[PDB]
Design a binder for this molecule. Structure first.
Ligand code: CL
Ligand code: CL
Ligand code: CL
Ligand code: CL
Ligand code: CL
Ligand code: CL
Ligand code: FE
Ligand code: FE
Ligand code: FE
Ligand code: FE
Ligand code: FE
Ligand code: FE
Ligand code: FE
Ligand code: FE
Ligand code: FE
Ligand code: FE
Ligand code: FE
Ligand code: FE
Ligand code: FE
Ligand code: FE
Ligand code: MG
Ligand code: MG
Ligand code: MG
Ligand code: MG
Ligand code: MG
Ligand code: MG
Ligand code: MG
Ligand code: MG
Ligand code: MG
Ligand code: MG
Ligand code: MG
Ligand code: MG
Ligand code: MG
Ligand code: MG
Lengths: 171, 171, 171, 171, 171, 171
């Protein structure tokens, strides 16, 4: 029992542990997407850099939830990080799968907030709002914008489209 | 139907469209107040600059709600911007009408927040808190302070009062 | 009756009030065009910035006519700002509608100048020439140039065209 | 009755007055703790500076709640500041009493937030979250860390422990 | 019994403890005066800053007497800080009450010096002369100067007077 | 079949995929060790920073083997990252477990080199020598040095030992 713990429910402590695992899974998916574009048979350098930066951001999102667990007096509990569920076939197909991943992560964060509201934990509500909810909203909007451009340009059939998008939008 | 929309109720999307129209109406009122003080028969230069800056701020408040509608996957819907409801007769009477306008805009924002709370939209609650609620509180306090000074100085009878307030408080 | 008024006809004072309303209407149309390109299903960032800058310019054109009314001893009279008359369907269709708007605003300014010539108001003629007539001529030429490029590139069918125009001409 | 007051309940106005008194009491306790370490029979200079800085922070927390009362149109109501409830016997015993004080102040702030939630005051909820709740969480964690180090080093029996902690952790 | 104590009488040690309490009471009175001028129904910003600076100075006067108690080998003994004895009704009435407070604090310091002279404590006499007696003389003179200006200007009836004093003398 | 592949055996391509998984496992172990020292009941800040830096280094070791797979024309194949096998009980016990981990990673790299020598792959031998073998030798030596210091200082019984090591060697 922690000398610092106060107003922190056991169900919130477990939900934070489940959230950490998800953030580490998203980092793994973005790492797989990055090295697919570094292959000699795909070769889109800016797509690779974009997905590698997204992988590093998800690892920072996980480390800050681990900081929070200890700040409130909970105890961290880790599980296996699952292999990504997948072949990426093109620049367009990868951005669409990244859009569905960020919407999944956003649904979990909204569920975590409902729980923290039921347990009357206002410090935890503000933590989630401050550091996670507008970041997901901005990230999902950006991926939607990217998917729209690739399609209007002629992807996935026009191989010229993904090459020029690589230079102008990601470059 | 929007590929980015998530946890965003149709009633919240309509209430945001109504909010935009109000912000544009406040910009119009402040523009009318500014050019009344630029008249040769009134001639208070610092009152004119103060009200013109307030007009530009309300236009920025409107553009950021239009940014938000698109971020969440809603669709903007515009209506006519009504002519201001009015003659401004003095520096004091104009500050009192500006105080009643900012309290009207604050009542609408509080209603928008109650709705967003009923629909369990925590990203929208935090958006309103972060960018709108303490700004209205600071603005209403400032106008109250200004009205109190003009009255204690002898306005609207002392024409010396509004001249000296123009130089010391707004100058 | 104004201690500063001289050689300033009542018909010129009313025509200036009508001109102000038009400038504010053009600002509203350009604001609607800007946020259409910020939508997740269109996503042309440079088209959005171009139309937002045009909206701010029309608001400056209106504020300077309000300055002029007071300089000559007239009195400002405001009316409702009408909702824009419209769906924008593409980058090309929006530039064509902007070209027709700037030609409408130019026809009103030419009518205002004919009136000021009939009333032998040479200060008002020079004001319109100095600050409004070559600006409309330059603006209409620019929009004509933009429309010509989009068509020759394959718009509105080639979705690649509007993407590349966004980067090279507006970027 | 205040020309600026809006959506601000009498029960919230009284609870804010009670909160101010508590913040001033915490400043007084930290001032007593500081000068105990400045005594010739204790002589821990860095312990004295640490507790004096904590006293100044609590006085800033009180002044900002007094600013808030006036911002919302309430009226400040002051009571006597009670003498601290105490002999501090060592560096360890003082950090443990500071940990219990910061947890008491946090329980009052959580009660104030529940009240503001019942009265549907969202500006007051965000004020408390922004400026008070993560500060208490960070402060309680820091004191827990300090207590743990002193005990593991051999306090309160090892007089070497508190001397070396003074130089390395607070120095 | 203190290894450092020398030529320091028990009656001087108790009189220093009583002096500390008074300095903390003066800080509390100046804090109440400051936030009265921050109210929306008074609104004199420079009066508020002046009284807040005076509150911080009285807290420094108290901390230096606590430093002195320990320097000479005495032991600090704290009592409750009483609520201020009061409604401030105007800028003039507040300066007059501040003038009577600083004369009360000066009478206590003169009594403390008589005692230190009877006990032949020359280090304590010089301490009081160096750090306290000319400061009270300068402070009382300044308040007398301020009261004289407000009255000659027409206070408390002329509300213009306190506004202009706020800008010129305190601004 | 890869247009760039040359002198690169299928058994080497699989052994590189197994090596990647191990590097990611070591990053996970070092991340768990870091947040154990950030707990309020342990509180060794420099131990936490040391283990977090080691976690980031192992992730860089993995990304460079993924770069190498693609450089030679192989294809990356990912597996689940296993949860760490463990309670860390003290600073000493954690350094000893880190020493055994780095010796395990070194045994795998030596096996990978024997295989690359059997298949006469000299580019792969030099890659492993250049970027991995002296790094493990330096890392194992450093951990041995750390374990020796903690024991000679009195760990795990002397809680003073791990505190002072935290400040002098890691600080
Ligand atoms: Cl708890
Ligand atoms: Cl939805
Ligand atoms: Cl005329
Ligand atoms: Cl109210
Ligand atoms: Cl003595
Ligand atoms: Cl081969
Ligand atoms: Fe991201
Ligand atoms: Fe994330
Ligand atoms: Fe404003
Ligand atoms: Fe607004
Ligand atoms: Fe233009
Ligand atoms: Fe124009
Ligand atoms: Fe603190
Ligand atoms: Fe506090
Ligand atoms: Fe918030
Ligand atoms: Fe003073
Ligand atoms: Fe004093
Ligand atoms: Fe002297
Ligand atoms: Fe390492
Ligand atoms: Fe490694
Ligand atoms: Mg599996
Ligand atoms: Mg935010
Ligand atoms: Mg009407
Ligand atoms: Mg909330
Ligand atoms: Mg804020
Ligand atoms: Mg209509
Ligand atoms: Mg010209
Ligand atoms: Mg008592
Ligand atoms: Mg915060
Ligand atoms: Mg009493
Ligand atoms: Mg003498
Ligand atoms: Mg002197
Ligand atoms: Mg297992
Ligand atoms: Mg080498």
């Amino acid at each position: 029992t922690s000398q610092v713990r106060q107003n922190y429910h056991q169900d919130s402590e477990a939900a934070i542990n489940r959230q950490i695992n998800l953030e580490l899974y998203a980092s793994y998916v973005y790492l797989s997407m990055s090295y697919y574009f570094d292959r000699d048979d795909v070769a889109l350098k800016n797509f690779a850099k974009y997905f590698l930066h997204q992988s590093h951001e998800e690892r920072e999102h996980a480390e800050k939830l681990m900081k929070l667990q200890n700040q409130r007096g909970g105890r961290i509990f880790l599980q296996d990080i699952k292999k990504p569920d997948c072949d990426w076939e093109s620049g367009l197909n990868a951005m669409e799968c990244a859009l569905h991943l960020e919407k999944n992560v956003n649904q979990s964060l909204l569920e975590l907030h409902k729980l923290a509201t039921d347990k009357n934990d206002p410090h935890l509500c503000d933590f989630i709002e401050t550091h996670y909810l507008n970041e997901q909203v901005k990230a999902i909007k950006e991926l939607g914008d990217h998917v729209t451009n690739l399609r209007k340009m002629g992807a996935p059939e026009s191989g010229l489209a993904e090459y020029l998008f690589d230079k102008h939008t990601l470059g």
